Design a protein around this ligand. Structure first.
Ligand SMILES: *Cc1ccc(-c2ccc(C)cn2)nc1
Ligand SMILES: [Ca+2]
Length: 269
């Protein structure tokens, strides 16, 4: 039996699916701890930039969880992603510890721009800027990648890098009441929000687990971007980002929420 995590319903992905929009033909890179083989995921390819972890399999869990929110398969098992037919790529930039470097992350972004990715999900960040990372965000953007990044979990009224950069789409987290999750960073540069509390997704060991974080919000938006791209194949990264923002539901505060709650039904109408 398959069940639909609450956040998938909250972003109105099933309405898009009913219109035949699933993310088919859209390439989405998950720049994370890897993605493990799982019966509810279809991993097309990828690369590792973590020395000593030459495989793209996930030794942490976080990247597999993020991947399932984007693209868990629509079938009779497990869960269901926002964009269940997205073409998923495992771009390992963080090790099994959950840590990486700005160089590794930059290499993953360069890979995304050299391999035709439409969307890159970066459920990662840090309070400090990085020239290395910024250059790579800008380069990937110039190659047509929509970079979607988590605002961070410190609870502060400023957001992490790379989400803070103009060429990243910064995603904060909401709860079941459509309030900002207490940990979700907000403020200048925040673009949009999505569910990030009690998010069930795929997890290594061929199982499922629930997590909290702006890391869980981000892939809802990455998946929504893939739905928009399937509907509008000619559109650029900027056009997709703008349309997601323009069709988001206001949550009553730009400071806190950016454009508001992503809405895949309104974005694919
Ligand atoms: C510091 C830290 C620890 C754990 C995580 C995490 C693990 C697993 C899942 C599903 C979500 N988040 N993030 C940051
Ligand atoms: Ca499934």
């Amino acid at each position: 039996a398959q069940s639909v995590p609450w956040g998938i319903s909250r972003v109105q992905a099933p309405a898009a699916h009913n219109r035949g929009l699933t993310g088919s033909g859209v390439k989405v890179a998950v720049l994370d701890t890897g993605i493990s083989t799982h019966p509810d995921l279809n991993i097309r390819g990828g690369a590792s930039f973590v020395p000593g972890e030459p495989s793209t399999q996930d030794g942490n869990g976080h990247g597999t969880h993020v991947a399932g929110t984007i693209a868990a398969l629509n079938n009779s098992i497990g869960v269901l992603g926002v964009a269940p037919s997205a073409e998923l790529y495992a771009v390992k930039v963080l090790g099994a510890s959950g840590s990486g470097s700005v160089s590794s992350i930059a290499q993953g972004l360069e890979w995304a721009g050299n391999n035709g990715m439409h969307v890159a999900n970066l459920s990662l960040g840090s309070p400090s800027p990085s020239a290395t990372l910024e250059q790579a965000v800008n380069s990937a953007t110039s190659r047509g990648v929509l970079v979607v990044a988590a605002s961070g979990n410190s609870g502060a009224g400023s957001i992490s890098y790379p989400a803070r950069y103009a060429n990243a789409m910064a995603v904060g987290a909401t709860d079941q009441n459509n309030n900002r999750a207490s940990f979700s960073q907000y403020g200048a540069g925040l673009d949009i929000v999505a569910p990030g509390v009690n998010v069930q997704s795929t997890y290594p060991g061929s199982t499922y687990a629930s997590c909290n974080g702006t890391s869980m919000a981000t892939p809802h938006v990455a998946g929504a971007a893939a739905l928009v791209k399937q509907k509008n194949p000619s559109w650029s990264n900027v056009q997709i980002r703008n349309h997601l923002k323009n069709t988001a539901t206001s949550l009553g505060s730009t400071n806190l929420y950016g454009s508001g709650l992503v809405n895949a039904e309104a974005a694919t109408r």
